[PDB]
């Protein structure tokens, strides 16, 4: 399941997320949310959870960047004013 | 950077962590801490945190085993009374 969120960067000054990079002997795993801090715009929405994969932010698609470039772009965008839209793929299960 | 830990399950009913696994088909993943609920054993200890990678519990050693078996081991150990001692690798920066 894919989900799309909008964060109001008016009230909040930061997302409150850690970003964990999966890399392997291929290293293209992607980037995921590790934890979420109370106090930020993500916790206030409720939707995202640790382990969610981050696919795209405002438009930029991260599915084929390197982990280090997708974060370089996330950093620059939270570093500017304006609403931040995120879309993520949510964690799965079954063993 | 590892670190190990004993959890007197005597004040608690469970560890307070969920687990997540990376396929290590032939990709040696293993299982990581996903999140830590408050007031469970791991939180009181506060020394373990999201994505530390889980290496052994109570004498058994998770490195060469499939994710499922690891997980099975952990739940059995969790269900029996007794300290419980985890040893887990710290997510790297």
């Amino acid at each position: 399941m894919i989900i799309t969120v909008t964060l109001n960067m008016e009230k909040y000054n930061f997302l409150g997320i850690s970003i964990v990079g999966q890399s392997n002997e291929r290293g293209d795993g992607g980037i995921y949310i590790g934890s979420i801090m109370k106090g930020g715009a993500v916790a206030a929405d409720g939707r995202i959870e640790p382990g969610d994969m981050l696919l795209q932010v405002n438009d930029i698609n991260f599915e084929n960047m390197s982990n280090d470039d997708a974060v370089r772009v996330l950093r620059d965008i939270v570093h500017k004013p304006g609403p931040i839209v995120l879309t993520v793929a949510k964690l799965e299960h079954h063993h | 950077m590892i670190i190990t830990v004993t959890l007197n399950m005597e004040k608690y009913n469970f560890l307070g962590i969920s687990i997540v696994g990376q396929s290590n088909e032939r990709g040696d993943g293993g299982i990581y801490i996903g999140s830590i609920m408050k007031g469970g054993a791991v939180a009181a200890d506060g020394r373990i945190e999201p994505g530390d990678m889980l290496l052994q519990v109570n004498d058994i050693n998770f490195e060469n085993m499939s994710n499922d078996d690891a997980v099975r081991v952990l739940r059995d150990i969790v269900h029996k009374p007794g300290p419980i001692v985890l040893t887990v690798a710290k997510l790297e920066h």
Binding site: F14, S18, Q22 | -
Partner: peptide, 8 residues
Amino acid sequence: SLKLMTTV
């Protein structure tokens, strides 16, 4: 394996 990238 995994590693912390930043926090934003």
